[PDB]
Short mmCIF file of C-alpha atoms in Angstrom, two decimals:
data_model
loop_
_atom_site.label_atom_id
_atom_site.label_comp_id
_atom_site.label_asym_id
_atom_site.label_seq_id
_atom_site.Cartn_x
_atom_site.Cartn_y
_atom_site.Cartn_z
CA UNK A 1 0.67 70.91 35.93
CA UNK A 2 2.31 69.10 33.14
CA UNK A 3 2.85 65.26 32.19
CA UNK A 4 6.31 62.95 33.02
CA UNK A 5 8.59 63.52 30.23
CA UNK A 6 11.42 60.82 30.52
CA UNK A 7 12.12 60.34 26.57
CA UNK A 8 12.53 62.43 23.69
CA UNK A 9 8.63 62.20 22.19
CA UNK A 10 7.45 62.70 24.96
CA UNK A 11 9.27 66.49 25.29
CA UNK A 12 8.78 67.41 21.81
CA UNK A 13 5.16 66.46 22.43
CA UNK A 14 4.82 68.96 25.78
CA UNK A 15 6.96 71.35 23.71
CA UNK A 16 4.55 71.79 20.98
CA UNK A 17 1.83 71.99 23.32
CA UNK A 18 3.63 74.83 25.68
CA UNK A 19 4.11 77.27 22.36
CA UNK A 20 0.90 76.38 20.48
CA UNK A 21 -1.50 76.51 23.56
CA UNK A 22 -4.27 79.31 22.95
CA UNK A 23 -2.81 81.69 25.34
CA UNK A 24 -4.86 84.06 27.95
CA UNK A 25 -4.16 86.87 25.88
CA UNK A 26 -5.47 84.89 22.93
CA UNK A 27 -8.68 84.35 24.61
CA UNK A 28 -8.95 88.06 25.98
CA UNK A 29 -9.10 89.30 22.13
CA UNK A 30 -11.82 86.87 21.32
CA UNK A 31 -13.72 87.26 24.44
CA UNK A 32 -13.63 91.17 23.70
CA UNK A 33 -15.03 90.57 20.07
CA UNK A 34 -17.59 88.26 21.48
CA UNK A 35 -18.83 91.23 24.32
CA UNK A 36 -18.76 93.98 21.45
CA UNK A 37 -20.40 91.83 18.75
CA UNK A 38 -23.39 90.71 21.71
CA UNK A 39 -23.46 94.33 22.29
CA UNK A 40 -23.67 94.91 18.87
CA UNK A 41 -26.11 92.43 17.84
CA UNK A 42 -28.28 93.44 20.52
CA UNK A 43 -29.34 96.70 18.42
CA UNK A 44 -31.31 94.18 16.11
CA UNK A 45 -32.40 91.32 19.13
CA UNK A 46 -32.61 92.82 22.22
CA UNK A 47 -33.31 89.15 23.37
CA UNK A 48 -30.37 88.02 22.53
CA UNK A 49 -26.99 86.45 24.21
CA UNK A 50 -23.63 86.23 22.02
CA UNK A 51 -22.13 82.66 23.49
CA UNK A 52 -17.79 81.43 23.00
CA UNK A 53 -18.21 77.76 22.12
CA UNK A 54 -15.17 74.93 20.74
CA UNK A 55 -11.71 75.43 20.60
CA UNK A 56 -11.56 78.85 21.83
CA UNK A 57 -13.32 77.37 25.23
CA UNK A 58 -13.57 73.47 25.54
CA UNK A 59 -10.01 73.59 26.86
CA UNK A 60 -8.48 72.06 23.36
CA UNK A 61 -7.59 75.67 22.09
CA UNK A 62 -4.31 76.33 19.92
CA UNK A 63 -2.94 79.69 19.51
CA UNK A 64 -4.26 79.51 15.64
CA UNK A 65 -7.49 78.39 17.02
CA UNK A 66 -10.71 80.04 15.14
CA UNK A 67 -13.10 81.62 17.51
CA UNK A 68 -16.59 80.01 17.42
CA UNK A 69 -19.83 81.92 18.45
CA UNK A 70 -23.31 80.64 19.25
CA UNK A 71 -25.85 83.22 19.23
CA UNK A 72 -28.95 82.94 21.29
CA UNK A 73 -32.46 84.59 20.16
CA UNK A 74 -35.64 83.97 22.08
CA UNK A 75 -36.83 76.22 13.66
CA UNK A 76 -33.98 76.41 11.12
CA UNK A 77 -36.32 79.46 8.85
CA UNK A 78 -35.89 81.83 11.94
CA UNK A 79 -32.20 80.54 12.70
CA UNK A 80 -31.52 81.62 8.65
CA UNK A 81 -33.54 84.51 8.71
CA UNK A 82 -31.45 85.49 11.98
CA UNK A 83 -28.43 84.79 10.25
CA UNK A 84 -28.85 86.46 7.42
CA UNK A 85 -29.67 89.84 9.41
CA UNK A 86 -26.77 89.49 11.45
CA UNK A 87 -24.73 88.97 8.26
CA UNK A 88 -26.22 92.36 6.45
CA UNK A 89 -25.55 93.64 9.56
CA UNK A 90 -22.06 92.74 9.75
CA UNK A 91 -21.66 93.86 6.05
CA UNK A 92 -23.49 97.42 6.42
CA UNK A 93 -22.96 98.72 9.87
CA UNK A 94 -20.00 97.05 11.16
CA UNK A 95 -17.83 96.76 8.09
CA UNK A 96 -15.26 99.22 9.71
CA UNK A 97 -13.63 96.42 12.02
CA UNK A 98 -15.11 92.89 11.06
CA UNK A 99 -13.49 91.89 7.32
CA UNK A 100 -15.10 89.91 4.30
CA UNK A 101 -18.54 88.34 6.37
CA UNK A 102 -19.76 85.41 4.23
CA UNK A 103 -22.42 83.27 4.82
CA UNK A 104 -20.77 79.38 4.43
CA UNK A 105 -23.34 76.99 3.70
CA UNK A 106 -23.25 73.17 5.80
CA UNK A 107 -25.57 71.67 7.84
CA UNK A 108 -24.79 74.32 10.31
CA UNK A 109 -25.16 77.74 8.62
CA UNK A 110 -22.42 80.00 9.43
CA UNK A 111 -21.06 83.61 8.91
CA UNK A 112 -17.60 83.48 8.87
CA UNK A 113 -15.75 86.78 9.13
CA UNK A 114 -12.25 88.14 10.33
CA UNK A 115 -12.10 90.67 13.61
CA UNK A 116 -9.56 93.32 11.87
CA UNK A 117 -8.88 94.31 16.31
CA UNK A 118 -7.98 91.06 17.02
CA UNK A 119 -6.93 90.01 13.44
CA UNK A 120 -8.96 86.20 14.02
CA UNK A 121 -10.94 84.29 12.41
CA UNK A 122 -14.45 83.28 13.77
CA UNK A 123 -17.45 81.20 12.74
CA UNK A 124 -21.24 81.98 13.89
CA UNK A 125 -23.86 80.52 13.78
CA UNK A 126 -27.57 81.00 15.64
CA UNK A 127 -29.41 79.01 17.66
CA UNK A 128 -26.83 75.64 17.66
CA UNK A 129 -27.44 75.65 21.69
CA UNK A 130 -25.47 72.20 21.66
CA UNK A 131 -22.60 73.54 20.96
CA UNK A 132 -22.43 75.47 24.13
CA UNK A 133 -23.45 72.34 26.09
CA UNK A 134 -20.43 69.99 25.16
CA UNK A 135 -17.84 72.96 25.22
CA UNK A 136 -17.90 72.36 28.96
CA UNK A 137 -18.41 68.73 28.41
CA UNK A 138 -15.44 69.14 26.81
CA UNK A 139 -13.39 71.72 28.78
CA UNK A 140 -14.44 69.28 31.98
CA UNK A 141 -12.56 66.51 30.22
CA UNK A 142 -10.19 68.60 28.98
CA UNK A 143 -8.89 69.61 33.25
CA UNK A 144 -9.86 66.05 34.33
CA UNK A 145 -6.26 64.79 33.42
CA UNK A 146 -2.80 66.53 32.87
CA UNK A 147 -2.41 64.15 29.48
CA UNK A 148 -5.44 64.95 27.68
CA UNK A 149 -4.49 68.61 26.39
CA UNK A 150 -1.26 67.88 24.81
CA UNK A 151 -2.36 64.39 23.56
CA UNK A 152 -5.35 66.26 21.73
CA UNK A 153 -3.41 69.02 20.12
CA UNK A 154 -0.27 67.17 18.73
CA UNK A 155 -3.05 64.94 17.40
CA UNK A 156 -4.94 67.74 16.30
CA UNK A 157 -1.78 69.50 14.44
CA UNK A 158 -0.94 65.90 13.49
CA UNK A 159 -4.56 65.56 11.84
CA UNK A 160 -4.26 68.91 9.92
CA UNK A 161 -0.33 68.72 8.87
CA UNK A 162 -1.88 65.51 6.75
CA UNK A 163 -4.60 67.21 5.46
CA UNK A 164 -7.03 65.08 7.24
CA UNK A 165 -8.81 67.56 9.45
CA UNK A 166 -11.24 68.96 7.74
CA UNK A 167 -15.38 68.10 7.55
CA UNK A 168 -15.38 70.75 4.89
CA UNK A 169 -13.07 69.39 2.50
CA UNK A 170 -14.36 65.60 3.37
CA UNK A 171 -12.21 64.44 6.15
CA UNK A 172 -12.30 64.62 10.21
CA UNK A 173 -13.98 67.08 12.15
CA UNK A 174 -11.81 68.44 14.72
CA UNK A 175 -15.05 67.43 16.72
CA UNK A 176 -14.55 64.08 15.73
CA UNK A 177 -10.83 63.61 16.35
CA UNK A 178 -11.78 64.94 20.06
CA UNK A 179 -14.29 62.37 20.72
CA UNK A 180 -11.67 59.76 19.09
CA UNK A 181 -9.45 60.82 21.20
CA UNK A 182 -11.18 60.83 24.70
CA UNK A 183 -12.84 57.37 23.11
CA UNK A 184 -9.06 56.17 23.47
CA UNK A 185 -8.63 57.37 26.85
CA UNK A 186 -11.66 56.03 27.83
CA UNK A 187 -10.96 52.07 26.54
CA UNK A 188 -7.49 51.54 27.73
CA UNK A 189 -7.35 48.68 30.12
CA UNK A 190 -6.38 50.63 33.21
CA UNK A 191 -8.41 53.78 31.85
CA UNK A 192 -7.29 57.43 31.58
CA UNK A 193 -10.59 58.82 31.13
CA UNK A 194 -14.19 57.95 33.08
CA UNK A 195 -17.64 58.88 31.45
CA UNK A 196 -18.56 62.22 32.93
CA UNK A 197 -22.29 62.01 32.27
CA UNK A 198 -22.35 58.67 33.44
CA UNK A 199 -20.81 59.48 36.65
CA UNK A 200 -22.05 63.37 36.95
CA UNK A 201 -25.09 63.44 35.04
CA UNK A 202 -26.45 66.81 37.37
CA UNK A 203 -23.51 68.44 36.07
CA UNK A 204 -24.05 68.07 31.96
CA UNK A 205 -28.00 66.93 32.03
CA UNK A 206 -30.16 68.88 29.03
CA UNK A 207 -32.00 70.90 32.04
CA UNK A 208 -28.94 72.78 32.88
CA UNK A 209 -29.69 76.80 31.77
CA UNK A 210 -27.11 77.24 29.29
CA UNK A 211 -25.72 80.66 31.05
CA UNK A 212 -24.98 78.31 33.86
CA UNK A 213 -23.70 75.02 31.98
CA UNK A 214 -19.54 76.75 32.62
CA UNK A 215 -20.17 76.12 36.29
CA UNK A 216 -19.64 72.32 35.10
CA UNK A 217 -16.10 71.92 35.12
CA UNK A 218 -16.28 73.99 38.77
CA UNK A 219 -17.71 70.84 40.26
CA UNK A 220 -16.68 67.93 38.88
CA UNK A 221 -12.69 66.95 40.87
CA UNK A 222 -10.19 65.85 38.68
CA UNK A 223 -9.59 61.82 37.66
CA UNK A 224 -6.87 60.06 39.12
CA UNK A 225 -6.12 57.05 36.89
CA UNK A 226 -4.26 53.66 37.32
CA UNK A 227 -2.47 54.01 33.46
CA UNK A 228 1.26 55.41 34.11
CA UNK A 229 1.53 55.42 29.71
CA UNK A 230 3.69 58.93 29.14
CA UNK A 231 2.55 60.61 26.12
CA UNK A 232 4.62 59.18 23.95
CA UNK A 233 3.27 55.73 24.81
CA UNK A 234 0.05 57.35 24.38
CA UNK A 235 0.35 58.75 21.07
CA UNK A 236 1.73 55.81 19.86
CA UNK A 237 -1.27 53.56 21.23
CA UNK A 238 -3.51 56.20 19.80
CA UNK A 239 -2.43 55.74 15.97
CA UNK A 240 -2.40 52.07 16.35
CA UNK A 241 -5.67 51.95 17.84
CA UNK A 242 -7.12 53.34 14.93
CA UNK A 243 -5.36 52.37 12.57
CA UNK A 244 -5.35 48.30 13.28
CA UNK A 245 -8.38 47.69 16.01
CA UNK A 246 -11.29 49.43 15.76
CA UNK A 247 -13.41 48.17 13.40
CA UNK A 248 -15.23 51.27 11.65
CA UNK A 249 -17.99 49.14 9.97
CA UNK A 250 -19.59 48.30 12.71
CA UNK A 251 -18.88 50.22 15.91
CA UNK A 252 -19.72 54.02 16.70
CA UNK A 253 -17.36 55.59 19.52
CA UNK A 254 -19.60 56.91 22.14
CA UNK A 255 -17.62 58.88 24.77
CA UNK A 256 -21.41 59.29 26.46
CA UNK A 257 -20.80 55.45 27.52
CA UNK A 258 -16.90 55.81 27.59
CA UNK A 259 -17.40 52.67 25.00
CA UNK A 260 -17.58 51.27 21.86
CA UNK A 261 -20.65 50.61 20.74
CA UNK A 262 -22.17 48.71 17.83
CA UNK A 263 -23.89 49.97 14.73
CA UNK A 264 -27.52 51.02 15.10
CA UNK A 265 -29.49 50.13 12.16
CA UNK A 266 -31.25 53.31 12.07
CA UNK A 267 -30.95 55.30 8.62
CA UNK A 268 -27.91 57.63 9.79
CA UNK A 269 -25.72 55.52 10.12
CA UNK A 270 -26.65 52.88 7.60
CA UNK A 271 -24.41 53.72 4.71
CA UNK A 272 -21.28 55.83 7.02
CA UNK A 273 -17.78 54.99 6.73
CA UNK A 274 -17.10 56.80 10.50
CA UNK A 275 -19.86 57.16 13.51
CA UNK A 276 -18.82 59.25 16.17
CA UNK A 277 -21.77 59.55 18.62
CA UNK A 278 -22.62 63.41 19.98
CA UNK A 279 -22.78 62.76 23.46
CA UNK A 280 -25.85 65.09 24.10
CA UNK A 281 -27.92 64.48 20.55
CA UNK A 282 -28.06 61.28 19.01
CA UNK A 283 -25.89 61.97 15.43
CA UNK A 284 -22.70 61.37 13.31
CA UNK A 285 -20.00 63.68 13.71
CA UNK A 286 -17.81 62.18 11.14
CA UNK A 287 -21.20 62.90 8.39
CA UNK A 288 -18.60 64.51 6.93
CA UNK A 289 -16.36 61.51 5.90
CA UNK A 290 -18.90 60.35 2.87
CA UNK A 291 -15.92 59.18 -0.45
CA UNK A 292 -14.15 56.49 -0.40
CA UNK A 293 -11.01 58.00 -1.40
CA UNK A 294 -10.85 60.15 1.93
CA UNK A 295 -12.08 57.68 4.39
CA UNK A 296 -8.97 55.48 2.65
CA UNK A 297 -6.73 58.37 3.33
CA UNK A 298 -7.83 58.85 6.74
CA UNK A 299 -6.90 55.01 7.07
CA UNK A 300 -3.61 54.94 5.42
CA UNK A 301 -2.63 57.68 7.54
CA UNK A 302 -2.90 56.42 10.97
CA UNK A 303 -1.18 53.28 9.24
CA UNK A 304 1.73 55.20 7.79
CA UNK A 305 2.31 57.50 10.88
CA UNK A 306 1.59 54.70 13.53
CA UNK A 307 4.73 52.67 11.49
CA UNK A 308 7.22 56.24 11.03
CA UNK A 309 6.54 56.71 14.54
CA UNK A 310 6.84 53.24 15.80
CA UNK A 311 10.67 53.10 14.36
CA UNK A 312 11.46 56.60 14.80
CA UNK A 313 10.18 57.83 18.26
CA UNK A 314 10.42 61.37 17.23
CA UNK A 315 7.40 63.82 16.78
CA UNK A 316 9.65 64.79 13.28
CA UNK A 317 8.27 61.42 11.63
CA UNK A 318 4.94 62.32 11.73
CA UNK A 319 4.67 65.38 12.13
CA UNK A 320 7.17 68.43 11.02
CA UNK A 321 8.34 70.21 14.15
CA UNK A 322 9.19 73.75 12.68
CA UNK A 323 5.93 73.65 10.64
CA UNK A 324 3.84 74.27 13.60
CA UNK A 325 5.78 76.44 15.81
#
């Protein structure tokens, strides 16, 4: 199943999404380092499950996509004491095929570490349940329409080739360019994208035992839309949105209400430059957007590319084919 592809965007944009697609083979390694690290981890809590969560399942996976692991132990001192075992445990036991563990430091604590078998790069953390809960969110969204794939990872390459996509360094989660773009699909006139926990709410509610939340995207039937915009039209609408309409001082993007929402003057988001709503907890994905300087550069940005790629219609203006491939 693949989009229209009449003009010469539009191709380059389903060509970069056909090589740079996490491939089945991709996903094999990482769900083999997720079995053997549960199995592993399971020496020091018996009670425990090893969970894939983000790119490497949500369905908006890229061949250089970083695996992502939630684990599961039966508030935040036990999830850091947990952590930190895991991570000695990593060091000491298992340093024969897991490279340089290091515990990164964020709101979420992580170990970050390298599997030397499938030679990739994955992030856990312990106890972050939510993260399982809107990878099939997500990955439901991500099946619901033929479009929203390749529109999210040209966007997503886009994003990083400008050195915009990344909460660590000050700029956009990859998080928050997901919701922004499934906001987009969700606003156009004749829309691309409905609210699935509007419509579905059985499907995604809280109560759902996380073992079974992957049977989501089993029940929900695809979207059939009015919109007939190609992806090329859609890319183009997608920097211009942002980069001329949508007002970030006083709107949040809520892809839980497929709207646009206003400001609420509770204390997160009083001072923010960007509020992206978490559909299933109330908070700010874009947290990470806090100086000036980058929430400019994130702005001059979509206004630069949006005007390349309004006179040039090739995915060269914006965003260097043989750099990603």
């Amino acid at each position: 199943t693949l989009p229209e592809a009449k003009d010469k965007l539009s191709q380059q944009i389903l060509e970069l999404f056909e090589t740079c697609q996490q491939q089945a083979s991709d996903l094999k390694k990482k769900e083999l380092c997720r079995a053997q690290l549960q199995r592993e981890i399971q020496l020091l809590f018996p009670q425990s499950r090893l969970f894939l969560v983000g790119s490497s399942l949500n369905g908006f996976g890229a061949r250089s996509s970083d695996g992502d692991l939630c684990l599961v132990v039966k508030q935040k001192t036990e999830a850091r004491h947990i952590l930190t075992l895991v991570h000695k445990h990593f060091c000491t036991r298992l340093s024969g095929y897991i490279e340089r563990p290091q515990l990164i430091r964020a709101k979420v604590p992580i170990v970050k570490f390298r599997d030397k078998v499938s030679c990739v790069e994955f992030a856990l953390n312990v106890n972050n349940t939510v993260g399982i809960r809107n990878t099939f969110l997500l990955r439901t969204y991500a099946y619901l329409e033929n479009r929203v794939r390749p529109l999210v990872l040209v966007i997503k390459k886009w994003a990083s080739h400008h050195e915009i996509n990344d909460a660590s360094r000050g700029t956009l989660s990859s998080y928050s360019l997901v919701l922004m773009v499934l906001h987009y699909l969700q606003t156009l006139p004749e829309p691309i994208l409905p609210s699935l926990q509007k419509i579905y709410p059985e499907s995604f509610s809280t109560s759902v035992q996380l073992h079974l939340v992957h049977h989501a995207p089993c029940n929900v039937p695809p979207y059939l839309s009015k919109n007939e915009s190609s992806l090329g039209d859609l890319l183009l609408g997608f920097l211009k949105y942002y980069a001329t309409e949508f007002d970030w001082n006083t709107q949040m993007i809520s892809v839980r209400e497929a709207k646009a929402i206003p400001r609420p003057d509770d204390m997160e988001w009083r001072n923010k430059y960007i509020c992206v709503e978490e559909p299933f907890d109330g908070t700010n994905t874009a947290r990470a957007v806090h100086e000036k300087q980058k929430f400019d550069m994130i702005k001059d940005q979509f206004l630069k590319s949006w005007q390349r790629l309004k006179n040039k219609r090739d995915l060269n203006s914006v965003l260097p084919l043989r750099a990603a491939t």
